[PDB]
Each structure stands twice: as C-alpha cells, then as structure tokens.
Amino acid sequence: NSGIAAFEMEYTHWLEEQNRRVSEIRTALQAHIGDIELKMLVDSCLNHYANLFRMKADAAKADVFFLMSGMWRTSTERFFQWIGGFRPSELLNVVMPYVEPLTDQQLLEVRNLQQSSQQAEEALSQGLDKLQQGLVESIAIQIKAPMASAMENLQALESFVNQADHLRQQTLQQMSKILTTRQAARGLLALGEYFHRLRALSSLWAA
Amino acid sequence: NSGIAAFEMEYTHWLEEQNRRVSEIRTALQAHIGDIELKMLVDSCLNHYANLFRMKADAAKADVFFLMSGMWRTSTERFFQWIGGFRPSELLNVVMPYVEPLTDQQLLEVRNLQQSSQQAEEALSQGLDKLQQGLVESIAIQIKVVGAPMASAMENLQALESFVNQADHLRQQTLQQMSKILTTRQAARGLLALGEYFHRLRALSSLWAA
Amino acid sequence: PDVSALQLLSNSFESVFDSPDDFYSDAKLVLSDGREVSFHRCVLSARSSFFKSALAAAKKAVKLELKEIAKDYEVGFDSVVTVLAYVYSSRVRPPPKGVSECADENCCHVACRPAVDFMLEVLYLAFIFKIPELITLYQRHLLDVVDKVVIEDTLVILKLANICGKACMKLLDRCKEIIVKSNVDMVSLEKSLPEELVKEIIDRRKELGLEVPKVKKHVSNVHKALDSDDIELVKLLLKEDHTNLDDACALHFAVAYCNVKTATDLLKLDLADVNHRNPRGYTVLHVAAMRKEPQLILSLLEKGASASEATLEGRTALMIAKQATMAVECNSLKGRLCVEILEQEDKR
Amino acid sequence: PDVSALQLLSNSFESVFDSPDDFYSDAKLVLSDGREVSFHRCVLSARSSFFKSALAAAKKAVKLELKEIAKDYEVGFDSVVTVLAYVYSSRVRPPPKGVSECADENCCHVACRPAVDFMLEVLYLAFIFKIPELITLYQRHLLDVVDKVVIEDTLVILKLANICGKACMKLLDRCKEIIVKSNVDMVSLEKSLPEELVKEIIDRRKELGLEVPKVKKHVSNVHKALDSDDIELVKLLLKEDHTNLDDACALHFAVAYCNVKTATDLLKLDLADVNHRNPRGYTVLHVAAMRKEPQLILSLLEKGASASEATLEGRTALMIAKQATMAVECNSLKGRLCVEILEQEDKR
Numbered sequence A: 001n002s003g004i005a006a007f008e009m010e011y012t013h014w015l016e017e018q019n020r021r022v023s024e025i026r027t028a029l030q031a032h033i034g035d036i037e038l039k040m041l042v043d044s045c046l047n048h049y050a051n052l053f054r055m056k057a058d059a060a061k062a063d064v065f066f067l068m069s070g071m072w073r074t075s076t077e078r079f080f081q082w083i084g085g086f087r088p089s090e091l092l093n094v095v096m097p098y099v100e101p102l103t104d105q106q107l108l109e110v111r112n113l114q115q116s117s118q119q120a121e122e123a124l125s126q127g128l129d130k131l132q133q134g135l136v137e138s139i140a141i142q143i144k145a146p147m148a149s150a151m152e153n154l155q156a157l158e159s160f161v162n163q164a165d166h167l168r169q170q171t172l173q174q175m176s177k178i179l180t181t182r183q184a185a186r187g188l189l190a191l192g193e194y195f196h197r198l199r200a201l202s203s204l205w206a207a
Numbered sequence B: 001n002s003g004i005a006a007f008e009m010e011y012t013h014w015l016e017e018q019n020r021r022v023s024e025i026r027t028a029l030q031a032h033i034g035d036i037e038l039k040m041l042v043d044s045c046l047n048h049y050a051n052l053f054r055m056k057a058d059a060a061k062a063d064v065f066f067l068m069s070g071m072w073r074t075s076t077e078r079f080f081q082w083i084g085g086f087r088p089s090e091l092l093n094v095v096m097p098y099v100e101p102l103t104d105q106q107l108l109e110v111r112n113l114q115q116s117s118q119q120a121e122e123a124l125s126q127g128l129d130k131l132q133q134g135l136v137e138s139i140a141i142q143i144k145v146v147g148a149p150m151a152s153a154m155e156n157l158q159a160l161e162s163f164v165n166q167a168d169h170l171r172q173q174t175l176q177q178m179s180k181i182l183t184t185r186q187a188a189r190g191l192l193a194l195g196e197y198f199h200r201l202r203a204l205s206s207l208w209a210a
Numbered sequence C, D: 001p002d003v004s005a006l007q008l009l010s011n012s013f014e015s016v017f018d019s020p021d022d023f024y025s026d027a028k029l030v031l032s033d034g035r036e037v038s039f040h041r042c043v044l045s046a047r048s049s050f051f052k053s054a055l056a057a058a059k060k061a062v063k064l065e066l067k068e069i070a071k072d073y074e075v076g077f078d079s080v081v082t083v084l085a086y087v088y089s090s091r092v093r094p095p096p097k098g099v100s101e102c103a104d105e106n107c108c109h110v111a112c113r114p115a116v117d118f119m120l121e122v123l124y125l126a127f128i129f130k131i132p133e134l135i136t137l138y139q140r141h142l143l144d145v146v147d148k149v150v151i152e153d154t155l156v157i158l159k160l161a162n163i164c165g166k167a168c169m170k171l172l173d174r175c176k177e178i179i180v181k182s183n184v185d186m187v188s189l190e191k192s193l194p195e196e197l198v199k200e201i202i203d204r205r206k207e208l209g210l211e212v213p214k215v216k217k218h219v220s221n222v223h224k225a226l227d228s229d230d231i232e233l234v235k236l237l238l239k240e241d242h243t244n245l246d247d248a249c250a251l252h253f254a255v256a257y258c259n260v261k262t263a264t265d266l267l268k269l270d271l272a273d274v275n276h277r278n279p280r281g282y283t284v285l286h287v288a289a290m291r292k293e294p295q296l297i298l299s300l301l302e303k304g305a306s307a308s309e310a311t312l313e314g315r316t317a318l319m320i321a322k323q324a325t326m327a328v329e330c331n332s333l334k335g336r337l338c339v340e341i342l343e344q345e346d347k348r
C-alpha cells in the first residue's frame, strides 16, 4: 500500500524529530534556561505530539487493521501498545518520580485525572470488546444488510481509534496545564528517554 | 527482512497450491473417482497442510512476533486467529455439517477430538497469558536499570516460539486424527469444505478492501 | 368473414412452411440435437412476442439456438415442427407415427410415455413462444390424458406444469391433486420435484389428514450414504446393524436415482433380497425396467430375478420396458437394448 | 374449419402490412409518381405467382418499379394499397374517401368516373398480379356497374377489358354488346380503340343486322384536316360549299380530340352552331366539360353557349363537370380550375 509506505517514511522522520526535540529539551533542562525558551520548547514538543496524532489519523484511514496490530512500532512497545498506542495511566506512573515536589492542588488534579482516565479506558475497552465480538460473530454467521453492517462497523472502529487518541491528546494537554514549565520539560525528557529505551530494547530483542 | 519475505512468498505459493488442490478434489468428487485416487488426494491435502506448518515453524524462528501479529493473513481471518493460526475446535465445527452423515462411532470419536482440542487450546491460552504477564514484568525492569537481560530475552523468545510450536502441533494432531476417524470420501468432503471456507474468507476480505 | 380467402391464405402459408427456402427464408432455429429448421422473421415476429423481442435484440442470415432461450427443458424436433406449423398456418399438424407410439404393440398409444412426452414438449414450446391458443389446446389434451397415465409420468407432467408458471395453472392444479391422492415415496418427491413443490405437496397432504409417515433417521443416513457413492460407509452402517437393506429399500434407491456403479457394488455384496417389494409394489427389476438401464437389468438377471412378477397395476417387466421406449427405436438405443435383453430372457 | 385461428392469422398479417418497417420488410414497390409501398417478399411470393417470378428474377435492398412490370395502365396509389391489403389479410380495404368519389354531392359514387377509374385500376392490378379471386370480385362489380355508367367511360372500361386478356371475357362481351347496341360514332372508336378491336366491332355491327352508316367522304376529309394542324386546308375545304361544320360535328371533334388552339380558331371562325346537338345527343358545352379544358369553356360561354340545356339523361354541363372531376382536387388542379370557373359563371 502506498499510503502505508508514506506513513512509514513520515514516521521515520517523526522519530528523528522526536529525538532532536528530546536532545534539545535535555540541553535546556541541564543549562537551566529561562521559563520562556523552555516553555517554547515544551510547546514545540506538544505540537510534535499533535502532529503524531494527525499522521496516526491519516494512517488509520488507509488501513485501520494494520494500525491496530502495532507492527509499525518497536518490538518492546507491542507489549504496552493499547489500540494503536500507549496507555496514559502507565506513562503517568512512569513520570511520577520526576515531577515531585507537587503541591496539594497538583496532587489532587493528577489523582482526579488518573481516575477519569482509568474510567474512560475501561469504558472504551469494553466498547471495543463488544465491537470485536460482534464482528467475530457476524463474520462467522455470514461465512458459515451485510454491506451496511460492514460499513457501520468500519466507521465505529475508526471512531474508537480517533477517540482514544482524542483522550490521549486531552490528557497530555491536561498535564501540560497542571505542571510548571520546568516540571513539564522534565516529564517530556523522561517520556523521550523512555521511548528511546524501549526502542533500544527492541533492537536488543531483534539482534 | 529476507526471512519474512521468503515466508510471504512461500505463503503465496501455498495459497496457489491450496486453490489448485481444492479444485482438483472438487472435480474428483464430482466425477465419482475411485477410493484410491481420492485417498491420494486427501493425503496430499494433508501433506500440504504439513508443509504449511513447517513453513510456519520457519517463520516462528525468524520472527515469532510476526506470526502472532497475523498481518500476513487477510483482515477477516485475523478475527479468528489463535497463537499464530486458526482455532481447531472452530474449524471442526465449521466442517462438521459437510462430513455428514457420521456413524455413531465416528461421532463419538469426533466429539472426543473436539473436547481434547478445546482443553489443549485453553491450557495453551492460559500458558500464553502467564508468559505475557511475565514479559510485561520482566521488560519493566531493563528500562529502569542502566548478563541477565540478554539471557532473559533469549529464554522468553524460546518460550514464545515453543508456544507457537505447540499450537501448530495441536492443529496438525487434530487434522491428522480427523483424517483417521473419517473414510476417504467423508474426509475429502471435509477438506473441500475447509478449503472453500478459507477461500470465502479471503474473498470477503478482498470485498471489504475495495 | 369470407372463409375461402382465409383458407387460401392458410394453404399458401403451409406451402411457405413446407419449403421455406423457396420463399426467402431469413432466419434459422437450431435444436439441441444438431438439426435445424428454416423460418421467416416476419411471420414469427408477428405471431409471437417472444420471437419479436429475441430478433429485435439480436439485430441490435440469423441463427437462434433453442438451447439458450429455452434452457430448462430439452424439447424434441417434432414438437418444434408442430409449433412452427401452427405459427405459419394456424393448423395443428399431427406427429409422425412412432413418436407418439411406444414399443409395446398391445397399447393404443393414448396415454403412454412417448405421447405424454411429445405433448409436454409442445406445451412447453407454446409457453415459451407465448402462443395462448396452442397452450390452451395442449393443456386440454394433458388434462384429458393425465387421469390414465401412471403416477411416475404425472410427476414429470407436474414438473413442467410448474415450469409453465401461472399460464398452465389448471394442469398444475390437476397434477398436484393427483400426486397428493397417491402414495408416492418421500424420496421420489425429493428427487423429482424442487423443494417448493415438495413442501407445498406435504402441506396439502398433511392438511387433509392422509397417511404421511416420516423417514427414519437411520434410513435417511443409509440413503444419503448411497447418494454420495460411499459404499464402505453403508458397509459400516450395516456392521452397526442399525439399518437393513430390506427396510430401507436401498436396491430400489440405487437403481432409481443413484449411480449405476453404486448399485452394482451394492448388489455385489448380496445382503438383501432382489425380488423384494416396496410400499408402492415394485420390485428391483421393475424399477430397472422403468429406468431403462441395461447393466442393472443384466446384473439382476445374472444374480437372480423373477421376471414373471407384476405390479399392483398388472404390468410386468416386459410391459414396462416396452411402454417406456418409443416405437422409433424398434421399427438412444438404451430402451431398445433393455427390451431385447428382457425378450431374450423371456424364452430362456 | 377453425375460423378463429384463421381470423387471428389474418389480423396478424394485416397488422404486419399496417407497419411494414416494424416487421422486417425486405422489398419496396415504387409507383409511377414516386411513392413507395413497403412489402415482404415471402407473402407476395406465396400469394402472387407473378410476384414470385419477378422477385426470383430481381434477386438474380429490393425495389420493384410498378411503372415497368405493369406498363399497360397507369395505376394510382390507393388501388395499390387495396391490392396489397387484400394480398396480406385476404380482405378488401376501401380507399380513403375522395379517391373513389366525385365532386358531386348528389352523386352516389356508384357509376361516376372516379369510382369506375378506381375499380378499373384495381382490376388491372389483380390481373397483373395473378389473383383470380380479386379479379372475379371486381369483374362482377364492373359487370353490375357498366349498365349505369356513361358511354364515354364505358369506352375506357372496354379498353381495360380488352387489355386484361381472357380473364375478363364476361366484361369484354358485355362492353362490346353495350357499344354495338348504342349509336357511337366510328370516329371516336377508331381514335381510341385499337385497330383490331374497331374492326371486330364494325364486323359484329354489320353481321348482327344493326345499321352501320358509311363514313361520309367529306366528313372524313374534314376530320383528317382537323387532326393535322393546317387551317389553310380547312379554309380550302370549306370554300367548296360541300361541307358544313354542324353537319360534321366539327366543334365536337375539335373540343373532344383536337388541341385547344385548334378549337379556339374554329370557334373564332364563327361558322358553326355552338348549341348544336350531335347524333349522340350531346352539346358542345357537355363535350367541353368532359374534356376539362378551361380555355374552351371560356371561349364557348363568351360566344353564346347556353348552359341550361340538358342531355338525354338530363345532366347539364355543371353536373358533368362535377362527375368528371376528382373529389380530392376540390378539398393536378386543372379539374378544380374548370369546376371553379363553372361555379363562378353559374353564380351570375
């Protein structure tokens, strides 16, 4: 598929730019640069994640099934990939040691966000399970209205893939609003190094 | 990946040969050919499935993750995959109406085979779930820490390939025992039904991918 | 109206049909056998709407293959000749001697197989050509003859009456009633009629309260095993002792509907009486004569078959073999081969 | 006989004729004027042996020139339509009103000139096409009608009967009897009928006891001088005092058979009675109305022609001019011009 080839080259360049932005934010954190330039770099990282979601939405239109399999990510990320990406609550647990010290308000906001994210995760996962079971059953019946059901199911799957990404982007922005510039920068650095370490581990599992 | 490209070309040729053998067994059944040639065709369908399983084992050594991903199969078939292939109990239910009429003894043997296949599938599924949870936990360690990681990686890859090998073994055992319970004609009808099932699934994938 | 000028017109058109090449014939109708009939495009475009549509579609030296337009029933040559003669002159031309007559010389050829078959072919041709008067005349003929024709042929008449749809409604209804009032086997209904007709006949038979017993599951299993030409499966079923070939009438089934080789291999086992009857009263040899398969009759005569036994209607095997073959073949030579085999066995 | 089937055949072929292009017409009969009638080769090859031989010779995109295969009597278009309609459907089709009807609203159109002309044309077509039933039908119609037709039209009827060979023996004999019974001058006969016909008629008149006066020598000289345009020879013949234009009916001759300018000159000489009556019983005005020439009528009225005089049958010049002109011309327009001139003069 030409669309998937275009996605894979765009994704290679996205990974390269992610690595560049992580190196830049590392340098900014280590040089103790002022809030304004650091906030600009934070916002650049946020824009880059937004661009990730845009390319993911474009790729989902070409072949939603190939995106649900996760063959486009690294070998180690597949163990954590949930419907075409990572689980936000787990990344929150990942970043928790680096954001301290938190005020009472930040702690309340983070715990509320985690509870709401968990509830949304459970409800969306249940909806996907029901959708998946209904396609299994309907294909089984048909092989052993059909076009309309096929189209409906495809649209539903697309909506779920764009909804989970909507939730991920909303929670990411919520962290970008809860945290100070320095905290947000440290969290983005941690995220980038985490992803790089997973890719390195995948390379070790493939060597 | 040269190995994965080789696997995909072998699978393409396997599909072509499957279509050819299904057409031949359909024509032979319709022509009321004698038991000897029909049994030869049954044993060649069985040999072809065995060849599929060998090539799947070769793919499992190269990239077990690719086999579990199912992206080398068509979209609708992925809705039914289990540890790198189809679930034998479901294919048995699919083909049972076509190997009809069954004798009482054959009926008892087939239901026994179905129960044993179901129990093996459940045990393999539980083992794979436990392996995958252990993989989550063990992976969560190397990334935090800046001898053991490589050995654990290799042992876990061996465990995943072993699970794929056991699932392929279960499919091959169920196929060969169905081929031994049934007469040549009855077995031929069942293989024809199975082949048409797979072809219809692939056709539906092509229709949904238009 | 002046009848004289009309009769001269009819005579002129009969002379046209008799030698169509001498009157600028511009179209041809090719049969399924290989034979061909020359005809004019204007006459049949005027007399029948079907030919008007077919020629107008072909025009968008003209040859029309009868096997393509009428595909669900093999019609003979004399039926086409009669229908075209009526098209050209509005006069029903009688069929040649031998076509409507059977091999039997003790019959009046008024309700035998060759005659009913010719009538059916002509009626189907009239239905395809949408000639309503010809349809009505031969529908009348078939209702007049059906009350004497053996049930087995009434099944085929009902088959074609349903093929003719709502046009031959009267013949269809008659056939249906006749079949319902008869003790036809369930397997014969399944193997002679489509699912719709079988379900309709069963519903009507069950609404009147007639004796309609169900088929034993194990007997259905042996019959399906025979239908798939799996003799070893039938062997294993008889090993189970769940069924018997006598209670299942497997010989009658194999001779009537199954393949010849399957019936031969079933006879080669020698596990059932060859001279056994059925609820309809026919023995295996009688059904073999009805099917006109020489190898089955030969294998029955080589193993042991009484040819002097009659049916409930009083017909012997020789009578069935004679009345199933047309007189052309004794004046596919399969029926002639069966009749000569049985006449040899007579004086033997 | 089955009347309904024959009626449906006739209806189907009449519908074929009514829309020939819709039913694959393969031939075209073109008339003398330029009109075309589309017909099918098979129908006319069957019904007409003449058409069979003509199409078989033309076939050695098919057109037949009617002005060539007939070539003995100019036939209109409605008569051709009637003949082809009878050939196709075996029933006679009446022409559109106006073709077989005259311009006299009092005429019943049984014996007037348009009806007689149409009957003659259709009979000649039936003779040429070799159709004996139509020939006999219209021969009987003409036999029933000749007794009420004006003798000048009886001349044309007898001409057609002579042309149509032995197929109209009754008509020819009746026409010869009617002509020899009346006192028709020899001049007209010789200038219209062929030589052998006039000789036979004169022989029969002589042998039957009927009087046959000798042709006056000077009258014959005057007639020959009139036929050859030479006014000086006419003056020389008149200067001998041995001739008289009224005694020779020179005005009648010039108006009936001579050119317009010759009659105009003979009238300007003012040497003959305009209201003079010929032995037949007609005046010059009646002959001018029959001839259908407006200049002669205008010169006659301008010279003192009395229009109130009637013939032996009581018809004045107005009724003759009406019964001589086609009805379609008052709905070649030379007839309408004469009719309108006579109507305008009658209004004053």
Ligand SMILES: CCCCCCCCCCCCCCCC(=O)O
Pocket (backbone or CB within 6 Å): A049, A084, A085, A086, A088, A091, A092, A095, A168, A172, A175, A176, A179, A184, A185, A187, A188, A191
């Ligand atoms: C500035 C935010 C600091 C806190 C960050 C907590 C974790 C954010 C989770 C969003 C990560 C987005 C990356 C998704 C990658 C993918 O879809 O493959």
Ligand SMILES: CCCCCCCCCCCCCCCC(=O)O
Pocket (backbone or CB within 6 Å): B049, B052, B084, B085, B086, B087, B088, B089, B091, B092, B095, B171, B172, B174, B175, B178, B179, B182, B187, B188, B190, B191, B194
């Ligand atoms: C004689 C056999 C009759 C049909 C038996 C069907 C039930 C056996 C199921 C195993 C089929 C193996 C084919 C799947 C191959 C694959 O998954 O790659």
Ligand SMILES: [Zn+2]
Pocket (backbone or CB within 6 Å): C100, C101, C102, C103, C104, C107, C108, C109, C110, C111, C112, C113, C323
């Ligand atoms: Zn007979």
Ligand SMILES: [Zn+2]
Pocket (backbone or CB within 6 Å): D101, D102, D103, D104, D107, D108, D109, D110, D112, D113, D323
């Ligand atoms: Zn008139």
